[PDB]
């Protein structure tokens, strides 16, 4: 099927408490494979998946040089941004950057992403065409003028259509036991009496990969999304995912309630019943 | 400034069996800014060996971290996760409930 590679950078000012923090991580699909932490002793991009460990010293040297250079530009961006928003020198601020590529089933380029947030809000993003910029606020519009004049988007497009996809393809083959795998969810439902008069019904999906899943409850065939507590899909720690959905129902109506599961490892959507 | 409250889940990797070594997870997601304190607790005391994932974030820019450690569920030991963040007036303690 389709695959993706994404890099995530987080840059945080801490005035009076040293230079900004810079953390970088790399993912293929829902599997992390690299990190860099500017506060860590090693000062190296480090492996975080067994299949990247085999990369030679030119790779680790190259990636360390590149991520450090990114940390330095982000350091200076925190200044630009503070100045533009007229913010105090004392406060902590956060820049975030995400970028990467999607390929289809044929492993060919499908889409690219290159986007930035400041203090948890969109700042500037490269559009799907990889030529033009979305910039909401005035500060980001200033950035866009500078990046349009400097032809910044053409350099980013080259990485995203070429290099990003080349490396993704390599990783899919080297990490094929991990990344070309589907672990179908093991499903069940639990019941727990909250009192004499109502019960918590919880529908579980466990030990699945990839993370994408849908879990819904129906009452006599009506979706109960408004009344459902859906937790965020969460890591088991072993490279699989977990999720649950819960409804509180009147004691005795359990058989009116069905759970519905869709995951790529299922041949068909599954229905669990109190049956 | 934007602030978003951490969503806290405390859970085991595997279905718990008393006396059988397992992995305790505290997964905190949906939060902003990135500074956060997460501790796994046994009978109210911080577990010193705890590891965490590298800081990452979702499409909506909110952060997520996994804190984890080996543990052995028992009848009488009480496990929990304590989280503190700018959005919280005092640390929040979520008790591990194996019967969910
Ligand atoms: Na707080």
Residue numbers in the entry:
A (entry chain A): 1 to 275
B (entry chain B): 1 to 100
Which sentences did the original study use to describe this structure?
As the peptide-free dsA2 characterized above did not yield crystals, we used dsA2/GM crystals and vacated the peptide-binding groove of the GM dipeptide. To do this, we first alternated between crystal washing in cryobuffer (lacking dipeptide) and crystal cryo-cooling to 100 K (an “annealing” protocol). After two cycles of washing and cryo-cooling, we obtained a crystal structure of dsA2 at 1.75 Å resolution that is devoid of any amino acids in the peptide-binding groove (dsA2/peptide_free-1). The side chain of Phe9, which is also situated on the β sheet floor, has turned perpendicular to the peptide-loaded conformation, and now fills the space vacated by the side chain of His70. We propose to call this peptide-receptive conformation the unlocked state of the A pocket, defined by the release of the hydrogen bond between His70 and Tyr99 and the upward movement of the side chain of Phe9. In the F pocket of the dsA2/peptide_free-1 structure, there is an EDO molecule that sits deep inside the pocket where the methionine side chain is situated in the dsA2/GM2 structure, but the conformation of the Arg97-His114-Tyr116 triad is the same as in the dsA2/peptide_free-2 structure.
To better understand the peptide-binding process to MHC class I, we have recently stabilized class I molecules by the introduction of a disulfide bond between the alpha helices in the vicinity of the F pocket.
